[PDB]
Design a protein around this ligand. Structure first.
Ligand SMILES: [Ca+2]
Ligand SMILES: [Ca+2]
Ligand SMILES: [Ca+2]
Ligand SMILES: [Ca+2]
Ligand SMILES: [Ca+2]
Ligand SMILES: [Co+2]
Ligand SMILES: [Co+2]
Ligand SMILES: [Co+2]
Ligand SMILES: [Co+2]
Ligand SMILES: [Co+2]
Ligand SMILES: [Co+2]
Lengths: 252, 256, 253, 253, 255, 254
């Protein structure tokens, strides 16, 4: 049950990812064979739930690409449910301060380190108790990534980076650009300045920076600045744009 | 992406609705062709979730009937999710005061006007970013309808009616009659007085009054008093009652 | 595991039914409480499969109303599958002659009386072998109903009524009226003559006549002539027409 | 509408249960015929939601075994939704004190007794308004069981037992053992001591004690100590362990 | 209930299509807004059934793109079922001769023209009997497209082209190339020759030629030769190829 | 994409299986970790279809246990569909003679060897065209097992064994006992005699015998006789019987 994504990040190995919003275990398997280091199953902005996360985890399982899951909110209940179907790496939206970051971490750990609910007998996570000593091994293989997505989050970043158990800090540019007054224009220089400053600040604390960006040149820039988990595209967009451009080339 | 239901309410055009509790994209399509101005996908009291709301929206889409969604609660996370699958008109249950009404409005609006989370590449709402100016146009096409459903809510109605972004106020007679101590009996005179008083107060404010009522004579009365979005039946009831009546017209059979 | 629909046909007690085409286990439950003697899960003209039939059977189970299933065709493999999920009364479409009726019967019976495939350990039908002597009891609780739906079938009614194991013969007025040249108009005198003649003919053989008809006055006539399983409405129609009438009472009118 | 699990509880009848985590209406039906007094549909630790709870309730309905549902948390909204699809017995997780217990009770009762939202017309719970007088009878048929799963809850037990409407108090050994420093080892003597003490307090207060324990010898011990709703197995475990043993018997030794 | 795809083929307006194998009503909607003239819901080689076809038809409905459905075989029962959920254009696989083509036609028509079973009260196709005189109007709005996919079928093309109610003839290049001994790869001179001669012959008969090909240069060539329904890509391929190229630009490789 | 089950049978290595009729990708995963050599997804007597077969194959994929699928009938179209979602080993019910065996084989092979329809671009089987030279390599990794389940099939067994592409012959005791006149009692000596004779006959032709039997003593005997793919239990039975026995230990009375 070693979490290989977590190990790679701790080792400073950059991981290239794809964001999955098609909410299908079928297209998930198709994309699991595409060569990405990680895949993000989006429970916040795509029509996923615990049940569809489960089937996408099952589809992805035999492939080299590692799954990461975003809950719809920093909710300990939903987090519990996602961990039990086998989620080991979690990308938590809208973490605004160190207290919220701490609660995200505590939501993933069994007592006394946290408040994760115990139900190993019926969890896929323990393979229904086939994994020996699962309850003693689980906490150390959880990888908690928190999203900073507002000015308020930026103010609290130094404190957030001091929270033990926060393995990575992810910058959400859509939300950040909107909160900064540039909605839909994360490429704006003021937003970019905040993003670059944050990436360096995160890496400088010895934690892993991450980000999603559709511009491949920006993605390379962030990697140069020390980003360690970079999502470089989104499935819905890849499909829609490729389809539209094809139709257009035939005058449809 | 302009919200035609919102525009109709703003113009003062009465809209006749059916409540959908069958939680099926199939029956949703069947009912979408029946001639209603609006259909309510009930996420509060029917076994719906974000995924089933999506398929019902897809089913209804080619028809003129406009979808409205009731979330299970005034919860910004659920509202975010419903909006991203394409919900533009929301009927929020159990809005008790103007602070709650304001929170419902803010949940539907992107910053700085609200706290709606941004995920347009993934959203049916933006047609997966096919709408270039989606983020700039979205707020103005959201239609927030708040349900007042308790004695407490009725006391707060004047302040609720001043909340910018509340486009309509809907009276929920089942919850209201129960809160008033008349469960299952909205026909009661004290309940009817609170309802009529509320419709008139809403009307005078310039916002749209709405209500659900299965009694067609009451429905007509409410429309006469100025109600602008009136749901006049429920799919489960229509089906059950028509089926029960039909079986009964044949009754028990003689053994021969 | 007694087939009470079958027993009622044998008692001579007419059974009033509703046709289910909403293809939902939720609306199936709602309608199971509506007071019908039987409910037809339509696998031919509604978007059902073996899986949705199963969930509809589960939904209906605690209610008095008895389920009947129409497969999409007289196909022994599909029939095998529907029986294993627990179907005991079948309404087979487009049965054109005695050969086809015999094949429908044999599809429902274990050897040597037929060719039903054996898989009781897996089957809801046996409650996963919880029911003792299931394999020895099952054949006799099957109720085979065959639809006659064309001029050819009507012509061949006498041979069909001689088939052992055919418990009832059901007239399908939509397909019949179309085949007769009156599509959409089963109320045509020529179609009604064929229907009434058939009902009497079936009644006389000792087998049960059945029919689906949305006109209530016609239904009462068919009952008067001896019909024993009469479906008197369709869920999709009841809902659609009720919704439409309601909207209209508030529209232009 | 009569809640027979609640009735049994009030009569002091010990009820033997099976925990369901397979999240399937198909295996639910198979297990509903197995002879258990009750079945726990786990909304907290199995991949269930309101919709799958509904289908499992429909599957279980015609059997004697009574359903109990664990919501994922003490959340009035989820509780409202679970009640409307027909849940009458709730096993609420992580109830830490008396205030939380009272809020669980209030979430199940209509005004003016509580805050349960009213939507009887489209609820399976009322059979779509086919149950009279549903709204007047519903509150009394709700059965609220609260789970005590931490040292804090154990400390607060005396006060929790004083909450009207709490019909039963359930000890969660997995969560309790972890909270006490023995994760994966509820067998441990000190955990056992805490469990046995709680059962006594509960029984002596006049409320029903409950527990889940897969070790049958410990189950029988808890029953002897006065526990009244005891879940003695988990479907996933029964299936996994049985399959593993079968495979191993055909492998080396 | 007017079948506009049929009307386009009859008018000689070339229709550009995309093949749908993702078997999802969600991606079907996303693709329905991409600007194609038609979309093929593949019930033969993708994990679809009558129920999933229905949901895809519903997702596609409000968009201009017209749905076409390939059943898994020329089976009148499956055809009956597909039609009742609202399919009006069928792409029937492995039609080998004129008799089989005629049987495909008859499966889509009510008596006396065919053997389609009558179930209009519960069919989406009639909008649950809201379309007045549906039973009298339905036949003329059915569009039957037959796939020729073997050397035998190619030999029988002249006779297949003489079958009334066959509105179009589609060449299946993967199956045809396999039958010709090229193991599913149609990019050989002799396969191309067979395809091109067939397109010309179909068009000269006054029927619509169709084809699926992922190579855009070949698609353009087939349009130049008179093909009227050309599918120019497959959803699974577009997605897989787009994703793999993207990973490869960051060094991430699956090859 | 090598079929390891097929290779095992060829090598004469016995494979222990579990029959899956719970029709769930969730329980399929749970049972995939249980230690079996193979798992039978039953499309004939459990409520499965191509779509549910697909999700069970996906669930099973990262485990050692190899999937086998039983179609509902020897139907080329259904076989085509099952193969495209990734099925490589088929257990075909009610194969009665050599013509039927030969047609099962042809249904699994691309031309010229068979009539399997070509749709590689959208098949999980080819992993959407990532498996190089899939169409050229697919035929040799297909494993065709035919079920003999009637007296007629028994009579025709020698010719069935003489059809190339038939990799294994499976005896279906429930159907066979019924056709023989002992419905529900496979244990009857006359059925057992037929079964044992068939097993030796299959082994002697060089091909792999298989059977399903829930009685573990009988299973061991069939293995001793040279059966090479033996299913020793059924998921639904395992679960129902274990649950019932548990309830009964606490007082449950029928
Ligand atoms: Ca510090
Ligand atoms: Ca514009
Ligand atoms: Ca009756
Ligand atoms: Ca000609
Ligand atoms: Ca070879
Ligand atoms: Co964000
Ligand atoms: Co209300
Ligand atoms: Co008919
Ligand atoms: Co617990
Ligand atoms: Co082809
Ligand atoms: Co068999």
């Amino acid at each position: 049950m070693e979490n290989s994504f977590k190990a790679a990040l701790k080792a400073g190995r950059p991981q290239i990812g794809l964001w999955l919003g098609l909410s299908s275990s079928y297209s998930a398997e198709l994309l699991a064979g595409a060569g990405f280091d990680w895949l993000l199953i989006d429970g916040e902005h795509a029509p996923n739930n615990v049940q569809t996360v489960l089937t996408q985890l099952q589809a992805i399982a035999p492939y080299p690409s590692q799954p990461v899951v975003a809950p719809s909110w920093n909710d300990p209940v939903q987090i519990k449910q996602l961990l039990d179907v086998g989620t080991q790496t979690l990308l938590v939206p809208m973490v605004q301060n160190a207290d919220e970051a701490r609660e995200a971490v505590r939501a993933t750990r069994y007592p006394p380190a946290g408040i994760r609910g115990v139900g190993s007998a019926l969890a896929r996570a323990s393979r229904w108790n086939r994994i020996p000593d699962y309850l003693q091994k689980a906490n150390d293989q959880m990888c908690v990534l928190v999203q900073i997505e507002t000015r308020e989050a930026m103010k609290n970043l130094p404190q957030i980076l001091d929270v033990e158990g926060v393995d990575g800090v992810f910058i959400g540019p859509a939300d950040l650009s909107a909160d900064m007054g540039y909605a839909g224009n994360p490429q704006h220089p003021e937003v970019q300045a905040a993003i670059e400053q944050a990436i360096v600040q995160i890496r400088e604390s010895g934690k892993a920076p991450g980000i999603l960006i559709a511009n491949e040149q920006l993605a390379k820039r962030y990697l140069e600045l020390g980003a360690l988990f970079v999502a470089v595209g989104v499935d819905t967009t890849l499909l829609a744009r490729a389809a539209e451009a094809l139709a257009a080339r035939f005058g449809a």
